[PDB]
């Protein structure tokens with residue numbers, strides 16, 4: 001009884017941000033999230049423009065952008081609207097509720113003003129979600145909970161992963177899914193986004209581990225691949241994005257049957 | 258065989274940042290860390306100047322500072338040098354090693370350029386520490402690992418806390434201690450810093466829980482109290498800081514015997 005992305009977009013309990021995402025995934029035949037891990041605004045925007053048609057989502061780390069301004073994020077929103085992708089700031093909020101509400105709305109970055117999606121670690125308990133939702137619910141935003149991590153020695157396993165799923169399922173007005181290595185929720189209203197993805201086997205020298213799009217979408221039942229260096233370090237980032245898009249999309253179609 | 262802060266500053270395996278901190282704690286009779294949770298640079302600097310003599314450490318969240326510039330952090334360093342306290346940026350690095358190294362050195366904040374101490378969640382595995390230490394070791398910085406949290410539903414318990422202690426004890430060239438609710442390491446070279454502290458019982462409406470300085474320093478064996486709203490929300494922040502300093506210092510003296 002697995003539903004297409006387009007049908008999941010219409011589920012009764014779907015969050016509007018999840019619905020928008022699932023509809024553009026189906027329309028564009030993409031379940032690829034670009035991890036735009038660059039330090040230059042011009043490179044971020046040139047990647048967003050060229051790869052926009054190939055991606056369902058662009059994931060930022062704006063705290064590594066040497067020339068961040070709010071006007072850069074206005075230009076990124078123009079490209080997201082044009083090419084139809086969501087903006088996901090990978091901030092990993094991980095503090096008490098009272099602190100993360102200020103980190104989400106305020107400071108230099110004003111993340112809530114431009115990010116469709118953010119994510120949170122569940123280690124502080126559900127106050128982290130309650131704090132974010134104070135800002136995010138009025139701004140019609142969504143949140144992903146980090147249920148598993150791709151890195152060597154990850155402690156996001158067993159009862160920790162189960163706690164993340166329970167926390168998501170109890171804050172479904174704001175939480176739209178997970179960062180995970182696999183399907184962790186049986187509820188089709190939740191998105192599964194998986195980092196640690198490359199076409200070739202291996203990892204990096206600081207604990208990153210890679211699995212293929214076929215493994216994580218096809219066998220492990222995730223929805224979306226998050227890809228950084230597999231695209232960003234390639235010479236032709238557009239062709240690299242197209243190879244990742246086709247891999248993730250076909251793995252999804254094959255699983256759907 | 259408990260040693261004074263001044264004697265712990267001389268331990269063979271002490272990190273130089275921990276030694277500097279322990280010496281100024283002993284000199285100034287303070288084991289209070291101010292949590293300077295304000296949105297205005299002028300309020301941050303006015304608190305740092307007035308409360309500097311009362312504190313061993315000033316903890317920042319620079320991502321909530323509406324008017325952050327690197328020149329604000331230069332002014333904060335001038336006050337830290339004058340009054341003798343360390344600067345601790347409570348960034349909660351919580352990503353794969355390759356990402357956190359860029360978040361620590363780069364972007365708008367250039368955290369490593371001004372923060373004596375930062376902290377990390379252990380959930381990604383030890384790559385988070387390896388990534389930070391690539392930047393922090395050359396800059397002679399230190400790191401705290403988050404072994405426990407003060408908030409309701411915290412998952413930083415049991416085997417998670419034990420994993421944080423093992424990770425600290427295996428990266429002792431860079432890791433100088435813990436954010437914890439209690440003594441979690443038996444090794445006196447490690448600092449224990451405890452947030453969730455107020456003189457009065459209670460909490461907040463977003464999962465914060467408070468314990469007293471006497472409870473966390475005296476009974477639970479921590480070294481340093483981290484205090485935000487108990488000071489910041491008071492009318493006279495200097496007198497509030499002095500009440501917290503005297504509470505934490507006497508609890509330490511009584512335990513030392």
Ligand SMILES: O=c1ccn([C@@H]2O[C@H](COP(=O)(O)O)[C@@H](O)[C@H]2O)c(=O)[nH]1
Pocket residue numbers: 035037061090148149150151179195196197208226227228229230352353356
């Ligand atoms: O468990 C996780 C959570 C997040 N990321 C993020 O996903 C991207 C992976 O990049 P890459 O290894 O594909 O270059 C990075 O931005 C990293 O911070 C992971 O790699 N693993």
Ligand SMILES: O=c1ccn([C@@H]2O[C@H](COP(=O)(O)O)[C@@H](O)[C@H]2O)c(=O)[nH]1
Pocket residue numbers: 095096099292294318347405406407408436452453454465483484485486487
């Ligand atoms: O387990 C933890 C870790 C960190 N903090 C931080 O310590 C301060 C506590 O502030 P307050 O509750 O004393 O105002 C805040 O900056 C918060 O982010 C906690 O409260 N609890």
Ligand code: PRO
Pocket residue numbers: 199200201212
């Ligand atoms: O792990 C493997 O053997 C295959 C080869 C490419 C990616 N996955």
Ligand code: PRO
Pocket residue numbers: 456457458469
């Ligand atoms: O918990 C209690 O009862 C005491 C009263 C002040 C703070 N601790």
